[PDB]
Amino acid sequence: KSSENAAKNSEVAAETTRDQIQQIIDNAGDQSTLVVLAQPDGFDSIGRVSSFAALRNLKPKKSGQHVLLTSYYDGWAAENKMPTGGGEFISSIGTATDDGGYIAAGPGYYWTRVVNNNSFTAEDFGCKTTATPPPNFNVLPAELFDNTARMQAAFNLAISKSFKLNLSAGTYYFESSDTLRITGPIHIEGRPGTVFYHNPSNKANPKTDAFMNISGCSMGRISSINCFSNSYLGKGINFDRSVGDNRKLVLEHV
Amino acid sequence: DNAKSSENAAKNSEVAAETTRDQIQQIIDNAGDQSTLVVLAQPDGFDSIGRVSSFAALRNLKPKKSGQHVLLTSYYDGWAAENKMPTGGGEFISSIGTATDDGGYIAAGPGYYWTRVVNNNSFTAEDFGCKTTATPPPNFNVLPAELFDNTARMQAAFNLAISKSFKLNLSAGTYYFESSDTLRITGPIHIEGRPGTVFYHNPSNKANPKTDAFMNISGCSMGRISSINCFSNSYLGKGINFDRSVGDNRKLVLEHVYVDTFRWGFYVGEPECINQIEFHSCRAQSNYFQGIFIESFKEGQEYGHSAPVHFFNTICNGNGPTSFALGATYKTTKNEYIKVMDSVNDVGCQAYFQGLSNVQYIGGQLSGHGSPRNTSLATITQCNSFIIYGTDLEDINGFTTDGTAITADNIDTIESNYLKDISGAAIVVSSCLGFKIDSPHIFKIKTLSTIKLMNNTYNYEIGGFTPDEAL
Amino acid sequence: TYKTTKNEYIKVMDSVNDVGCQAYFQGLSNVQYIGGQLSGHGSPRNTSLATITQCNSFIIYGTDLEDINGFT
Amino acid sequence: YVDTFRWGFYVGEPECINQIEFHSCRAQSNYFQGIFIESFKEGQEYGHSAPVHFFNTICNGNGPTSFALGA
């Protein structure tokens, strides 16, 4: 009775408000999409670049544009992981040397990363991690992607711009005839579980060739890395004077 | 009665519809004559993008398709009424399927979930719903102003940091804990606090308030924990307990970790669980019995040890029962009363080392400010190669194991009746091979001697410390 | 014998009389070894745990030393 | 690192550096001293700060050179 009267008035008022919303949304001919953007999930309406190669092929109308990169490689959703290596980029008109990390160059333009807190991760350069193998003798990890050239680009950027390099847990696989070089002062910070795994198969002298060479790294800091090879071949870290003295380098949990 | 109950739900639907209409009207009014692109173009256009208000709202937000990115302003809403800024927010990505809810990393609903986007392999505790508050003074029974228990959310945060190997960042302020469960680290981890980070522990809900550990560390090989200040203001419980329930803490490093006003600051009570551990710049202060308590095995038990153990620039100060503590009674939040003392003859010491090997105490300090009842400053039993490099030792108030005060008047009597007692010096060494001390400055020692040797300590070596300080 | 990813084989050993040690120091000065450990767990063939040659001022502070399997 | 001042690290009163720590620091090419710690001067009340820890710190090339004296 009395409850029913208010319950039916509620239906009438709700329908009138529905008609009012219909009317105002129809009247707002050119502004109705602002209602779409203001919803709690409105940020999804903004577009973003899918991978670093797509970013290389993206032609900017004018210098100074800002864009979002979701991840370095696409296809993380089909697998069971999260995007990685993404960020924000700014366009410039001109020529610059492609880096694979910092700078994505195309024909007559390029894009540069916005770096926060003077630090970046190795995933930003296309490095991949996998499951850590056991320490048994001739045992290799399950997935074999060689990180040597991409990790050397990351080291070069960290030495040149004096950013800190951050490394994620997992194993990075290395199998190349070149040795990984550190050529000036650098900050490197890993996580418990960061592993560098070295396969000496492509080396010219597997018995004596160094995996990592460090030289000229004054006042640098390297921390929380675990290198192993499971081979009984090679040098693990070779300290050198090809660039200069490592005057006050600090190694901690290596 | 069903009609009267559903009337309120109908009115709630009415109010929600009217408020919706009001938001659309507000948007259209603010937009004005200008087109959508122009509005976006305006220097403040970023405000026209919708955001989730809180983590619960995100749990209720149903994604149309997997792969959407959304923004979360803060973990809790209402920060603007309070005079503080949002915290705990970020970006989330949707997935269609089932996953175990977390309260942090993953917000799960029926048939969908949202996953947080983590930057630089690190995250904060606010991301998991933890709250801070103003720090209480160190007085005896003083609680912080507002009491929100952080135990289960901080436990979830530790689980994520161990599982995904992210670094856990903590903010200034006190995290309050009052729970019947002990906070466990079970794997390698990085924890980094700020100057001002405090963990306050309330033992009122513990089953054994006197002996139950606040925090438990096991298996933490290669971890690093820094810049945290744990205190409890109760003279009850263990501060941090190291176990082998998961494994050995094989090269764990602690820096700037302070533990105050528990019953024992740092506690170890079984063998082979602190091999190669490091304490840098740590502190244990005003605990009831000991600041550091290491005891690999008890008497009659199978022999065992952990080795080596390293202390660098660590200071233990004020540990041991004072007269106030002896007479004090703790009042719980359930209005219980717990007597702090065990007996009226209680004594303690600053540090206690038993059953270890290759121990180094470099620098640092061991002092007795505030006049607690101590048998010694350090007590060393059944160790091999304990070495002391330049450690400041000062201000002991001397007692025997029985509780008898050691003054000048009775000094001779003590020497006759307590010869075999493990007490009566600033440093007591008992059954220790390879003991060594260089020449630190020692002063204000109210005890029979500065160093005491007993129980087959047979190749010791004593450098020249400050002479004529004892009785 | 190590098997490479190109199906090559490499003899791990150099000679059937190979010996090693844990740490080798030659031609240094003012060296401090504070704490730590040097140990032969797993029974490798060692001439020593630590070999020090042609140095000025090598100092060891409390290092743990254990478990050597002696060879010339 | 502190270089080419008159003093690099200066302390001139008691009870202000209790338990301070220097790791891997440098004082180089200052005019008088690299590290200068002085709790009290002559005729002043006794005081001190304690303990004080240096770990792998270097003081190199401090003091007045002939060029510095003529500069």
Residue numbers in the entry:
A (entry chain A): 155 to 408
B (entry chain B): 152 to 622
C (entry chain A): 480 to 551
D (entry chain C): 409 to 479
Task: Give passages from the manuscript.
To understand the whole architecture as well as the potential modes of action of Depo32 on the K2-type CPS of K. pneumoniae, the structure of Depo32 was solved by cryo-electron microscopy (cryo-EM). Atomic models were built into the 2.46 Å nonsymmetrized and 2.32 Å C3-symmetrized maps and refined iteratively in real and reciprocal spaces. Both the nonsymmetrized and C3-symmetrized maps presented well-defined electron densities in the core region, and they all revealed trimeric architectures, similar to the overall characteristics of the previously identified tailspike proteins with known structures. In the core region of Depo32, since the resolution of the C3-symmetrized map is slightly higher than that of the nonsymmetrized map, and because of the inclusion of the potential CPS binding, catalytic and/or regulatory domains in this region, we then focused on the C3-symmetrized map and model to perform the subsequent analyses. In addition to the invisible N-terminal anchor domain and the helical-bundle domain (to residue 185) that may form the head of the spike protein, the remaining core region of the Depo32 monomer can be further split into the following domains: (i) a very short neck helix and the connection domain (residues 186–271), (ii) the β-helix domain (residues 272–642), (iii) the connection helix domain (residues 643–666), (iv) the carbohydrate-binding module (CBM) (residues 667–846), and (v) a C-terminal domain (residues 847–907). As is typical of other TSPs, the β-helix domain of Depo32 adopts a right-handed solenoid-like fold that consists of three β-strands in each coil turn that are stacked approximately in parallel into a triangular cross-section. After the β-helix domain, the CBM of Depo32 presents a β-sandwich domain that exhibits a “jelly roll” fold, which is composed of eight antiparallel β-strands that are arranged in two layers of four-stranded β-sheets.
In the present study, Klebsiella phage GH-K3-derived depolymerase Depo32 (encoded by gene gp32) was identified to exhibit high efficiency in specifically degrading the CPSs of K2 serotype K. pneumoniae. Phage depolymerases specifically recognize the glycosidic bonds on the host surface and randomly degrade them to release the repeating units (oligosaccharides) of the glycopolymers; thus, the phage particles can move closer to the cell surface and bind to host receptors. Here, GH-K3 gp32 was identified to encode a depolymerase, Depo32, which efficiently degrades the CPSs of K. pneumoniae K7 (K2 capsular type). In summary, Depo32 effectively binds and cleaves the CPSs of K2 capsular type K. pneumoniae via the putative active center constituted by Glu545/Glu423 and Asp546/Glu423 and initiates the hydrolysis process, causing the pathogens to become sensitive to elimination by the host immune system and thus achieving protective effects.
